[PDB]
Amino acid sequence: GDSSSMSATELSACKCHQWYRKFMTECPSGQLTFYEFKKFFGLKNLSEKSNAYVNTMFKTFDIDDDGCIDFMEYVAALSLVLKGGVQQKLRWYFKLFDMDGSGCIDKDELLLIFKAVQAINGAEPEISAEDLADIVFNKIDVNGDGELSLEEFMEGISADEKISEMLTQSLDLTRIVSNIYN
Ligand SMILES: [Mg+2]
C-alpha cells in the first residue's frame, strides 16, 4: 500500500499470515470496515470505481454475516488466494456470490452482487459478472421459481469451465494491488 514504499507486488506475492497476524496484533476489534480496508491500501479515494470495488469486494468477502471484515474473513481470503488447489477454490467460490449464510439463489440479489463485482471492471472488456450471469441463466432453468441451487453452480461449472476458470482467474494479488495504485 501507500506506506514506507516497499515493493507492493512482491509483498502480495509473498503475503502469508503476516497480514492476518498483523491485524490481530494491531487490534482485535472483531470486524474491520471499509475505512480499515482503505487503511491498508493507499489512495483513500482514487476513484468512484475503486469505491465500488471495495463495496463489491467487501460483499464478496463478507461471506459470513455482516458487510465488514470479520475475524477469519481476511485469513480465509489469504488462505484461498494462496496457490493451493484450483478445484478447492471453486468450492470456496460457491459459498460466496450468494446470499449471506449460503443457501439457494435467485434472479435479483445475485444481479446486484454481480453488478458491484462487475462494477470494479467491465464495459470495454465486456467481462462483467452480470453479462456472464445472463448467459448462465439461459439453458440452466430448473423450475418456475427461477431459483438456482448449489446444483446449478456446480452444474454450470461441469457443463463448462469458462465461468469456473473466470472466477479462479479473477482472483489475484498484484493485479489487485497494481489496479489500486493506478
Ligand atoms: Mg462480512
Short mmCIF file of N, CA and C and ligand atoms in Angstrom, two decimals:
data_model
loop_
_atom_site.label_atom_id
_atom_site.label_comp_id
_atom_site.label_asym_id
_atom_site.label_seq_id
_atom_site.Cartn_x
_atom_site.Cartn_y
_atom_site.Cartn_z
N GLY A 1 0.83 -1.20 0.00
CA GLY A 1 0.00 0.00 0.00
C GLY A 1 0.86 1.25 0.00
N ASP A 2 0.25 2.39 0.33
CA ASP A 2 0.98 3.65 0.36
C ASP A 2 1.67 3.84 1.71
N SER A 3 2.76 3.11 1.93
CA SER A 3 3.50 3.21 3.18
C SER A 3 4.95 2.81 2.99
N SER A 4 5.86 3.55 3.63
CA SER A 4 7.28 3.26 3.53
C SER A 4 7.62 2.59 2.20
N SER A 5 6.94 3.00 1.14
CA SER A 5 7.18 2.44 -0.18
C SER A 5 7.16 0.91 -0.14
N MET A 6 8.34 0.30 -0.12
CA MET A 6 8.44 -1.15 -0.08
C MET A 6 7.71 -1.77 -1.26
N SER A 7 8.30 -2.81 -1.85
CA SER A 7 7.69 -3.47 -3.00
C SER A 7 6.29 -3.96 -2.65
N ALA A 8 5.31 -3.54 -3.45
CA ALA A 8 3.93 -3.96 -3.23
C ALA A 8 3.71 -5.34 -3.82
N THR A 9 3.96 -5.45 -5.12
CA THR A 9 3.76 -6.71 -5.81
C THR A 9 4.40 -7.85 -5.04
N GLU A 10 5.70 -7.75 -4.75
CA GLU A 10 6.39 -8.80 -4.04
C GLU A 10 5.73 -9.10 -2.69
N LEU A 11 5.29 -8.07 -1.98
CA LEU A 11 4.65 -8.32 -0.69
C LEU A 11 3.42 -9.18 -0.90
N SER A 12 2.60 -8.82 -1.88
CA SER A 12 1.39 -9.59 -2.16
C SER A 12 1.74 -11.00 -2.62
N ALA A 13 2.78 -11.10 -3.45
CA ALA A 13 3.21 -12.40 -3.95
C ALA A 13 3.79 -13.25 -2.83
N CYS A 14 4.19 -12.61 -1.74
CA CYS A 14 4.76 -13.33 -0.61
C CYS A 14 3.78 -13.32 0.55
N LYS A 15 2.83 -12.41 0.48
CA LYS A 15 1.83 -12.28 1.53
C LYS A 15 1.47 -13.66 2.08
N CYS A 16 1.53 -13.79 3.41
CA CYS A 16 1.21 -15.06 4.05
C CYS A 16 0.22 -14.85 5.19
N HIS A 17 0.68 -15.07 6.42
CA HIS A 17 -0.17 -14.88 7.58
C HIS A 17 0.20 -13.59 8.31
N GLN A 18 1.21 -12.91 7.77
CA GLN A 18 1.68 -11.66 8.37
C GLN A 18 0.59 -10.59 8.38
N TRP A 19 -0.20 -10.55 7.31
CA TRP A 19 -1.29 -9.58 7.25
C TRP A 19 -2.35 -9.95 8.28
N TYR A 20 -2.77 -11.21 8.22
CA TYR A 20 -3.76 -11.72 9.16
C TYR A 20 -3.25 -11.58 10.58
N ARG A 21 -2.01 -12.02 10.79
CA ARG A 21 -1.38 -11.92 12.10
C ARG A 21 -1.27 -10.46 12.51
N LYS A 22 -0.91 -9.62 11.55
CA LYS A 22 -0.77 -8.19 11.81
C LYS A 22 -2.08 -7.60 12.31
N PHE A 23 -3.18 -7.98 11.67
CA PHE A 23 -4.49 -7.48 12.07
C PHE A 23 -4.81 -7.82 13.52
N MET A 24 -4.62 -9.08 13.89
CA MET A 24 -4.90 -9.49 15.25
C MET A 24 -4.04 -8.71 16.23
N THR A 25 -2.75 -8.59 15.91
CA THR A 25 -1.81 -7.88 16.77
C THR A 25 -2.15 -6.39 16.88
N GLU A 26 -2.50 -5.76 15.75
CA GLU A 26 -2.81 -4.33 15.76
C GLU A 26 -4.05 -4.01 16.60
N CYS A 27 -5.05 -4.88 16.56
CA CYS A 27 -6.26 -4.66 17.35
C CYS A 27 -7.35 -5.67 17.00
N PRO A 28 -7.84 -6.38 17.99
CA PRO A 28 -8.93 -7.38 17.81
C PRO A 28 -10.31 -6.74 17.96
N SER A 29 -10.59 -5.74 17.12
CA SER A 29 -11.87 -5.05 17.17
C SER A 29 -13.02 -6.00 16.86
N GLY A 30 -12.71 -7.07 16.13
CA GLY A 30 -13.71 -8.06 15.77
C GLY A 30 -14.05 -7.99 14.29
N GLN A 31 -14.22 -6.77 13.78
CA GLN A 31 -14.52 -6.60 12.36
C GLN A 31 -14.00 -5.26 11.84
N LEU A 32 -13.46 -5.27 10.63
CA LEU A 32 -12.90 -4.06 10.04
C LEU A 32 -13.80 -3.56 8.92
N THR A 33 -14.13 -2.27 8.97
CA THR A 33 -14.99 -1.68 7.95
C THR A 33 -14.18 -1.25 6.73
N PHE A 34 -14.84 -0.54 5.82
CA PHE A 34 -14.21 -0.08 4.59
C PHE A 34 -13.01 0.83 4.86
N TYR A 35 -13.12 1.70 5.85
CA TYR A 35 -12.02 2.61 6.16
C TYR A 35 -10.78 1.82 6.54
N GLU A 36 -10.98 0.75 7.30
CA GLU A 36 -9.88 -0.11 7.72
C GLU A 36 -9.23 -0.78 6.51
N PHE A 37 -10.06 -1.15 5.54
CA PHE A 37 -9.55 -1.74 4.31
C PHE A 37 -8.69 -0.73 3.58
N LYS A 38 -9.23 0.48 3.47
CA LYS A 38 -8.53 1.57 2.81
C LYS A 38 -7.26 1.92 3.57
N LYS A 39 -7.28 1.68 4.88
CA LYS A 39 -6.12 1.97 5.71
C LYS A 39 -4.92 1.17 5.23
N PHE A 40 -5.15 -0.12 4.96
CA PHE A 40 -4.07 -0.99 4.49
C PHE A 40 -3.63 -0.62 3.07
N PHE A 41 -4.59 -0.22 2.23
CA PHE A 41 -4.27 0.14 0.85
C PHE A 41 -4.17 1.65 0.69
N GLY A 42 -3.22 2.08 -0.15
CA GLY A 42 -3.03 3.51 -0.39
C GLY A 42 -4.18 4.06 -1.23
N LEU A 43 -4.24 5.38 -1.35
CA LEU A 43 -5.29 6.02 -2.13
C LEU A 43 -6.62 5.94 -1.40
N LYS A 44 -6.89 6.94 -0.56
CA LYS A 44 -8.14 6.98 0.20
C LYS A 44 -9.34 7.00 -0.74
N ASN A 45 -9.25 7.82 -1.78
CA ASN A 45 -10.33 7.92 -2.76
C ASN A 45 -9.76 8.14 -4.15
N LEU A 46 -9.14 7.09 -4.70
CA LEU A 46 -8.55 7.18 -6.03
C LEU A 46 -9.62 7.49 -7.08
N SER A 47 -10.73 6.77 -7.01
CA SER A 47 -11.82 6.98 -7.96
C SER A 47 -13.12 6.37 -7.44
N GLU A 48 -14.22 6.70 -8.10
CA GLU A 48 -15.52 6.16 -7.71
C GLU A 48 -15.51 4.65 -7.93
N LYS A 49 -14.88 4.24 -9.02
CA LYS A 49 -14.79 2.82 -9.37
C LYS A 49 -14.11 2.04 -8.25
N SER A 50 -13.05 2.61 -7.68
CA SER A 50 -12.34 1.94 -6.60
C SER A 50 -13.28 1.73 -5.42
N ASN A 51 -14.16 2.70 -5.19
CA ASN A 51 -15.13 2.61 -4.11
C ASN A 51 -16.08 1.44 -4.33
N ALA A 52 -16.50 1.26 -5.58
CA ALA A 52 -17.40 0.16 -5.92
C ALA A 52 -16.71 -1.18 -5.66
N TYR A 53 -15.43 -1.23 -5.98
CA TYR A 53 -14.65 -2.45 -5.79
C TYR A 53 -14.64 -2.85 -4.32
N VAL A 54 -14.38 -1.89 -3.45
CA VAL A 54 -14.36 -2.15 -2.01
C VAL A 54 -15.76 -2.53 -1.53
N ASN A 55 -16.75 -1.87 -2.12
CA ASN A 55 -18.15 -2.15 -1.79
C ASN A 55 -18.52 -3.55 -2.25
N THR A 56 -18.16 -3.86 -3.49
CA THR A 56 -18.45 -5.17 -4.05
C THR A 56 -17.53 -6.20 -3.42
N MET A 57 -16.28 -5.79 -3.27
CA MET A 57 -15.26 -6.65 -2.72
C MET A 57 -15.61 -7.06 -1.29
N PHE A 58 -16.09 -6.12 -0.48
CA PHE A 58 -16.46 -6.46 0.88
C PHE A 58 -17.64 -7.42 0.86
N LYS A 59 -18.58 -7.16 -0.04
CA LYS A 59 -19.76 -8.00 -0.17
C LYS A 59 -19.37 -9.43 -0.55
N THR A 60 -18.37 -9.56 -1.42
CA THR A 60 -17.92 -10.88 -1.85
C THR A 60 -17.12 -11.57 -0.75
N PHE A 61 -16.36 -10.78 0.01
CA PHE A 61 -15.54 -11.33 1.10
C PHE A 61 -16.35 -11.45 2.39
N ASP A 62 -17.51 -10.81 2.43
CA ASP A 62 -18.36 -10.85 3.62
C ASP A 62 -18.72 -12.29 3.97
N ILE A 63 -19.01 -13.08 2.93
CA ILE A 63 -19.36 -14.49 3.11
C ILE A 63 -19.24 -14.91 4.57
N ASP A 64 -20.17 -14.47 5.40
CA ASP A 64 -20.13 -14.83 6.82
C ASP A 64 -21.33 -14.25 7.57
N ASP A 65 -21.50 -12.94 7.52
CA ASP A 65 -22.61 -12.31 8.22
C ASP A 65 -22.78 -10.84 7.82
N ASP A 66 -22.00 -9.97 8.46
CA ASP A 66 -22.08 -8.54 8.17
C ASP A 66 -21.29 -8.18 6.92
N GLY A 67 -21.30 -6.90 6.57
CA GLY A 67 -20.59 -6.42 5.39
C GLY A 67 -19.16 -6.00 5.73
N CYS A 68 -18.80 -6.11 7.00
CA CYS A 68 -17.47 -5.73 7.45
C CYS A 68 -16.54 -6.94 7.46
N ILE A 69 -15.24 -6.68 7.48
CA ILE A 69 -14.27 -7.76 7.51
C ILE A 69 -14.23 -8.36 8.91
N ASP A 70 -14.68 -9.60 9.04
CA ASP A 70 -14.72 -10.25 10.34
C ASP A 70 -13.53 -11.18 10.54
N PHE A 71 -13.17 -11.39 11.80
CA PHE A 71 -12.05 -12.26 12.14
C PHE A 71 -12.19 -13.59 11.40
N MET A 72 -11.11 -13.99 10.73
CA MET A 72 -11.09 -15.23 9.95
C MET A 72 -11.45 -14.95 8.50
N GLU A 73 -12.20 -13.88 8.28
CA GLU A 73 -12.61 -13.50 6.94
C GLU A 73 -11.40 -13.11 6.08
N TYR A 74 -10.48 -12.36 6.67
CA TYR A 74 -9.27 -11.97 5.96
C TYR A 74 -8.39 -13.18 5.71
N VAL A 75 -8.14 -13.93 6.78
CA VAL A 75 -7.29 -15.11 6.68
C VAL A 75 -7.88 -16.09 5.67
N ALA A 76 -9.21 -16.15 5.61
CA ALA A 76 -9.86 -17.05 4.66
C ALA A 76 -9.50 -16.65 3.23
N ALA A 77 -9.54 -15.35 2.96
CA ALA A 77 -9.20 -14.85 1.63
C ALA A 77 -7.74 -15.16 1.35
N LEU A 78 -6.90 -14.97 2.36
CA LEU A 78 -5.48 -15.24 2.24
C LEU A 78 -5.25 -16.73 2.04
N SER A 79 -6.00 -17.54 2.79
CA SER A 79 -5.89 -18.99 2.71
C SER A 79 -6.30 -19.50 1.34
N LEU A 80 -7.27 -18.84 0.70
CA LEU A 80 -7.73 -19.27 -0.61
C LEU A 80 -6.91 -18.62 -1.72
N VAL A 81 -6.55 -17.36 -1.54
CA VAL A 81 -5.77 -16.67 -2.56
C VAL A 81 -4.45 -17.41 -2.81
N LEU A 82 -3.97 -18.12 -1.80
CA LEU A 82 -2.72 -18.87 -1.92
C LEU A 82 -2.87 -20.01 -2.93
N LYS A 83 -1.80 -20.30 -3.66
CA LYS A 83 -1.82 -21.37 -4.65
C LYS A 83 -2.86 -22.42 -4.29
N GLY A 84 -2.47 -23.36 -3.43
CA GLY A 84 -3.37 -24.42 -3.01
C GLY A 84 -3.89 -25.20 -4.21
N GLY A 85 -5.20 -25.43 -4.25
CA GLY A 85 -5.80 -26.17 -5.36
C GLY A 85 -6.92 -25.36 -6.00
N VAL A 86 -6.94 -25.33 -7.33
CA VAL A 86 -7.96 -24.59 -8.07
C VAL A 86 -9.35 -25.15 -7.79
N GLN A 87 -9.45 -26.47 -7.77
CA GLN A 87 -10.73 -27.13 -7.53
C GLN A 87 -11.28 -26.75 -6.15
N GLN A 88 -10.38 -26.66 -5.17
CA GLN A 88 -10.79 -26.29 -3.83
C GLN A 88 -11.35 -24.88 -3.82
N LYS A 89 -10.73 -23.99 -4.59
CA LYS A 89 -11.20 -22.61 -4.66
C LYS A 89 -12.62 -22.61 -5.19
N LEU A 90 -12.82 -23.29 -6.31
CA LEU A 90 -14.15 -23.35 -6.92
C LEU A 90 -15.18 -23.56 -5.82
N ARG A 91 -14.94 -24.54 -4.96
CA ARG A 91 -15.86 -24.81 -3.86
C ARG A 91 -15.96 -23.57 -2.98
N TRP A 92 -14.84 -22.88 -2.80
CA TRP A 92 -14.82 -21.67 -2.00
C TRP A 92 -15.63 -20.59 -2.71
N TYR A 93 -15.58 -20.59 -4.03
CA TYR A 93 -16.33 -19.62 -4.81
C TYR A 93 -17.82 -19.81 -4.57
N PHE A 94 -18.24 -21.07 -4.46
CA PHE A 94 -19.64 -21.40 -4.25
C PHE A 94 -20.21 -20.79 -2.97
N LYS A 95 -19.51 -20.95 -1.85
CA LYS A 95 -20.04 -20.41 -0.59
C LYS A 95 -20.31 -18.92 -0.73
N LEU A 96 -19.65 -18.28 -1.69
CA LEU A 96 -19.83 -16.85 -1.91
C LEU A 96 -20.64 -16.60 -3.18
N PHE A 97 -20.74 -15.33 -3.56
CA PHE A 97 -21.51 -14.96 -4.75
C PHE A 97 -22.98 -15.29 -4.54
N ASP A 98 -23.33 -15.63 -3.30
CA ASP A 98 -24.70 -15.97 -2.95
C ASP A 98 -25.12 -15.23 -1.69
N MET A 99 -26.40 -15.31 -1.35
CA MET A 99 -26.91 -14.65 -0.16
C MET A 99 -26.09 -15.08 1.06
N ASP A 100 -25.97 -14.19 2.04
CA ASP A 100 -25.20 -14.49 3.24
C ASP A 100 -25.73 -15.77 3.88
N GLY A 101 -24.83 -16.59 4.39
CA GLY A 101 -25.22 -17.85 5.01
C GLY A 101 -25.41 -18.92 3.94
N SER A 102 -25.05 -18.58 2.71
CA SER A 102 -25.18 -19.50 1.59
C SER A 102 -26.65 -19.68 1.21
N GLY A 103 -27.08 -20.93 1.07
CA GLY A 103 -28.46 -21.21 0.71
C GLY A 103 -28.68 -21.09 -0.79
N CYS A 104 -29.94 -21.14 -1.21
CA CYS A 104 -30.28 -21.05 -2.62
C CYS A 104 -30.17 -19.61 -3.12
N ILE A 105 -30.11 -19.46 -4.44
CA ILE A 105 -30.00 -18.15 -5.06
C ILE A 105 -31.14 -17.92 -6.05
N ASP A 106 -31.34 -16.67 -6.44
CA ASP A 106 -32.40 -16.35 -7.40
C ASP A 106 -32.05 -15.09 -8.17
N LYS A 107 -32.84 -14.78 -9.19
CA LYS A 107 -32.60 -13.60 -10.00
C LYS A 107 -33.03 -12.35 -9.24
N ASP A 108 -32.07 -11.46 -9.01
CA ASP A 108 -32.32 -10.21 -8.28
C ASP A 108 -31.13 -9.89 -7.39
N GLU A 109 -31.03 -10.60 -6.27
CA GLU A 109 -29.93 -10.40 -5.34
C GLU A 109 -28.61 -10.72 -6.03
N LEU A 110 -28.59 -11.81 -6.79
CA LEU A 110 -27.38 -12.21 -7.49
C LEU A 110 -27.03 -11.19 -8.57
N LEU A 111 -28.03 -10.44 -9.04
CA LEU A 111 -27.80 -9.45 -10.08
C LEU A 111 -27.04 -8.23 -9.55
N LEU A 112 -27.44 -7.73 -8.38
CA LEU A 112 -26.77 -6.58 -7.80
C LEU A 112 -25.37 -6.97 -7.33
N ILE A 113 -25.24 -8.19 -6.83
CA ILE A 113 -23.95 -8.67 -6.37
C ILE A 113 -22.98 -8.69 -7.55
N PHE A 114 -23.46 -9.19 -8.68
CA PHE A 114 -22.64 -9.25 -9.88
C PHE A 114 -22.39 -7.84 -10.40
N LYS A 115 -23.35 -6.95 -10.13
CA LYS A 115 -23.24 -5.56 -10.56
C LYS A 115 -22.08 -4.85 -9.87
N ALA A 116 -21.92 -5.10 -8.57
CA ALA A 116 -20.83 -4.48 -7.83
C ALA A 116 -19.48 -5.07 -8.23
N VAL A 117 -19.44 -6.39 -8.38
CA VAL A 117 -18.21 -7.06 -8.76
C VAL A 117 -17.83 -6.67 -10.17
N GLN A 118 -18.83 -6.52 -11.03
CA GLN A 118 -18.56 -6.10 -12.40
C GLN A 118 -18.31 -4.60 -12.40
N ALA A 119 -18.77 -3.95 -11.34
CA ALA A 119 -18.61 -2.52 -11.18
C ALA A 119 -17.12 -2.18 -11.15
N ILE A 120 -16.33 -3.05 -10.54
CA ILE A 120 -14.89 -2.79 -10.44
C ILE A 120 -14.23 -2.99 -11.81
N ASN A 121 -14.91 -3.67 -12.72
CA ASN A 121 -14.36 -3.89 -14.06
C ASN A 121 -15.45 -4.31 -15.05
N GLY A 122 -15.37 -3.78 -16.26
CA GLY A 122 -16.35 -4.10 -17.29
C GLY A 122 -16.35 -3.03 -18.39
N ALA A 123 -17.39 -3.05 -19.23
CA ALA A 123 -17.50 -2.08 -20.32
C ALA A 123 -16.70 -2.54 -21.53
N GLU A 124 -15.56 -1.90 -21.76
CA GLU A 124 -14.71 -2.25 -22.88
C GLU A 124 -14.37 -3.74 -22.86
N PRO A 125 -13.92 -4.26 -21.74
CA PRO A 125 -13.56 -5.70 -21.61
C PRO A 125 -14.76 -6.61 -21.82
N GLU A 126 -15.95 -6.08 -21.54
CA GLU A 126 -17.18 -6.85 -21.70
C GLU A 126 -17.12 -8.13 -20.87
N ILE A 127 -16.31 -8.12 -19.82
CA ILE A 127 -16.18 -9.28 -18.96
C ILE A 127 -16.86 -9.04 -17.62
N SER A 128 -18.01 -8.38 -17.66
CA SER A 128 -18.76 -8.10 -16.44
C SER A 128 -19.38 -9.38 -15.89
N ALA A 129 -19.62 -9.39 -14.58
CA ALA A 129 -20.24 -10.55 -13.94
C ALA A 129 -21.69 -10.68 -14.38
N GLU A 130 -22.34 -9.53 -14.55
CA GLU A 130 -23.75 -9.50 -14.96
C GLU A 130 -23.93 -10.17 -16.32
N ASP A 131 -23.05 -9.85 -17.26
CA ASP A 131 -23.14 -10.42 -18.60
C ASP A 131 -23.03 -11.94 -18.53
N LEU A 132 -22.12 -12.42 -17.70
CA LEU A 132 -21.93 -13.85 -17.54
C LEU A 132 -23.16 -14.47 -16.89
N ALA A 133 -23.73 -13.76 -15.92
CA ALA A 133 -24.91 -14.24 -15.22
C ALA A 133 -26.07 -14.44 -16.19
N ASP A 134 -26.22 -13.52 -17.14
CA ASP A 134 -27.31 -13.63 -18.11
C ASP A 134 -27.15 -14.89 -18.95
N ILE A 135 -25.93 -15.13 -19.43
CA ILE A 135 -25.65 -16.31 -20.24
C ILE A 135 -25.88 -17.59 -19.44
N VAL A 136 -25.42 -17.61 -18.20
CA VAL A 136 -25.57 -18.80 -17.36
C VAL A 136 -27.05 -19.11 -17.12
N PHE A 137 -27.87 -18.08 -16.98
CA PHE A 137 -29.30 -18.29 -16.75
C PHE A 137 -29.95 -19.03 -17.91
N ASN A 138 -29.53 -18.71 -19.12
CA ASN A 138 -30.08 -19.35 -20.30
C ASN A 138 -29.67 -20.82 -20.37
N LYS A 139 -30.66 -21.69 -20.57
CA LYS A 139 -30.41 -23.13 -20.68
C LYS A 139 -30.08 -23.78 -19.34
N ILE A 140 -30.27 -23.06 -18.24
CA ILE A 140 -29.99 -23.63 -16.92
C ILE A 140 -31.21 -23.54 -16.02
N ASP A 141 -32.37 -23.24 -16.61
CA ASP A 141 -33.59 -23.13 -15.83
C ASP A 141 -33.89 -24.45 -15.12
N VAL A 142 -34.29 -24.36 -13.86
CA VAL A 142 -34.59 -25.56 -13.09
C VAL A 142 -36.10 -25.69 -12.88
N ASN A 143 -36.74 -24.60 -12.50
CA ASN A 143 -38.18 -24.62 -12.26
C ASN A 143 -38.78 -23.23 -12.46
N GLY A 144 -40.09 -23.13 -12.28
CA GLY A 144 -40.78 -21.85 -12.44
C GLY A 144 -40.28 -20.82 -11.43
N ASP A 145 -39.74 -21.31 -10.32
CA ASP A 145 -39.22 -20.42 -9.29
C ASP A 145 -38.09 -19.56 -9.84
N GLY A 146 -37.25 -20.16 -10.67
CA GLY A 146 -36.13 -19.44 -11.27
C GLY A 146 -34.94 -19.40 -10.33
N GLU A 147 -35.09 -20.00 -9.16
CA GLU A 147 -34.01 -20.04 -8.18
C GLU A 147 -32.96 -21.06 -8.58
N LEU A 148 -31.71 -20.82 -8.22
CA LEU A 148 -30.64 -21.74 -8.56
C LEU A 148 -30.03 -22.34 -7.30
N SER A 149 -29.98 -23.67 -7.24
CA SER A 149 -29.42 -24.36 -6.09
C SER A 149 -27.95 -24.68 -6.34
N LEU A 150 -27.21 -24.95 -5.27
CA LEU A 150 -25.80 -25.26 -5.42
C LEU A 150 -25.60 -26.18 -6.63
N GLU A 151 -26.66 -26.88 -7.00
CA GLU A 151 -26.60 -27.78 -8.15
C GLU A 151 -26.34 -26.99 -9.43
N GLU A 152 -27.03 -25.86 -9.58
CA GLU A 152 -26.85 -25.03 -10.76
C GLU A 152 -25.41 -24.55 -10.87
N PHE A 153 -24.86 -24.06 -9.77
CA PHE A 153 -23.49 -23.58 -9.78
C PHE A 153 -22.54 -24.70 -10.18
N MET A 154 -22.68 -25.85 -9.53
CA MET A 154 -21.83 -26.99 -9.84
C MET A 154 -22.12 -27.49 -11.25
N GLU A 155 -23.40 -27.51 -11.62
CA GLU A 155 -23.80 -27.96 -12.94
C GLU A 155 -23.23 -27.05 -14.02
N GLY A 156 -23.28 -25.74 -13.81
CA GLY A 156 -22.76 -24.82 -14.81
C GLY A 156 -21.26 -25.04 -15.00
N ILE A 157 -20.56 -25.24 -13.88
CA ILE A 157 -19.13 -25.49 -13.93
C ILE A 157 -18.85 -26.78 -14.68
N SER A 158 -19.64 -27.80 -14.38
CA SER A 158 -19.49 -29.10 -15.02
C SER A 158 -19.72 -29.01 -16.52
N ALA A 159 -20.71 -28.22 -16.92
CA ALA A 159 -21.01 -28.06 -18.34
C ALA A 159 -19.86 -27.35 -19.05
N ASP A 160 -19.20 -26.45 -18.33
CA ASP A 160 -18.07 -25.71 -18.90
C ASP A 160 -17.22 -25.11 -17.78
N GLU A 161 -15.96 -24.85 -18.08
CA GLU A 161 -15.05 -24.27 -17.09
C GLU A 161 -14.78 -22.80 -17.39
N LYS A 162 -15.51 -22.24 -18.34
CA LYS A 162 -15.31 -20.84 -18.69
C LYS A 162 -15.61 -19.92 -17.51
N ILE A 163 -16.67 -20.23 -16.78
CA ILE A 163 -17.02 -19.42 -15.61
C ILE A 163 -16.13 -19.82 -14.45
N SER A 164 -15.93 -21.12 -14.30
CA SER A 164 -15.10 -21.64 -13.23
C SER A 164 -13.68 -21.11 -13.38
N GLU A 165 -13.20 -21.05 -14.62
CA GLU A 165 -11.87 -20.53 -14.89
C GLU A 165 -11.83 -19.03 -14.62
N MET A 166 -12.91 -18.35 -15.00
CA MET A 166 -13.01 -16.91 -14.81
C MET A 166 -12.95 -16.54 -13.33
N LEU A 167 -13.70 -17.27 -12.50
CA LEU A 167 -13.71 -16.99 -11.07
C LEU A 167 -12.32 -17.22 -10.49
N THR A 168 -11.69 -18.31 -10.92
CA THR A 168 -10.35 -18.63 -10.45
C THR A 168 -9.35 -17.60 -10.98
N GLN A 169 -9.50 -17.28 -12.26
CA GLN A 169 -8.63 -16.31 -12.93
C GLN A 169 -8.80 -14.91 -12.35
N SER A 170 -10.04 -14.54 -12.01
CA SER A 170 -10.31 -13.21 -11.49
C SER A 170 -9.50 -12.91 -10.23
N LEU A 171 -9.48 -13.86 -9.29
CA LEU A 171 -8.75 -13.64 -8.05
C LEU A 171 -7.26 -13.47 -8.33
N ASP A 172 -6.64 -12.52 -7.64
CA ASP A 172 -5.21 -12.25 -7.81
C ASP A 172 -4.71 -11.33 -6.70
N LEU A 173 -3.41 -11.09 -6.68
CA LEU A 173 -2.82 -10.22 -5.66
C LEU A 173 -2.31 -8.93 -6.29
N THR A 174 -1.26 -9.05 -7.10
CA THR A 174 -0.65 -7.90 -7.77
C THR A 174 -1.64 -7.22 -8.71
N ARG A 175 -2.47 -7.99 -9.39
CA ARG A 175 -3.43 -7.38 -10.30
C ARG A 175 -4.30 -6.42 -9.50
N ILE A 176 -4.68 -6.86 -8.31
CA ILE A 176 -5.48 -6.04 -7.41
C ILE A 176 -4.66 -4.87 -6.86
N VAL A 177 -3.41 -5.15 -6.49
CA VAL A 177 -2.53 -4.13 -5.91
C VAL A 177 -2.17 -3.07 -6.96
N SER A 178 -1.84 -3.53 -8.16
CA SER A 178 -1.48 -2.63 -9.24
C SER A 178 -2.66 -1.74 -9.63
N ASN A 179 -3.85 -2.32 -9.67
CA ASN A 179 -5.05 -1.57 -10.02
C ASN A 179 -5.31 -0.45 -9.03
N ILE A 180 -5.12 -0.74 -7.75
CA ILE A 180 -5.34 0.26 -6.71
C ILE A 180 -4.41 1.45 -6.89
N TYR A 181 -3.13 1.17 -7.13
CA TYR A 181 -2.15 2.22 -7.32
C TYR A 181 -2.52 3.09 -8.52
N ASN A 182 -2.84 2.44 -9.64
CA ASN A 182 -3.21 3.16 -10.85
C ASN A 182 -2.02 3.93 -11.40
MG MG B 1 -18.59 -9.65 6.23
#
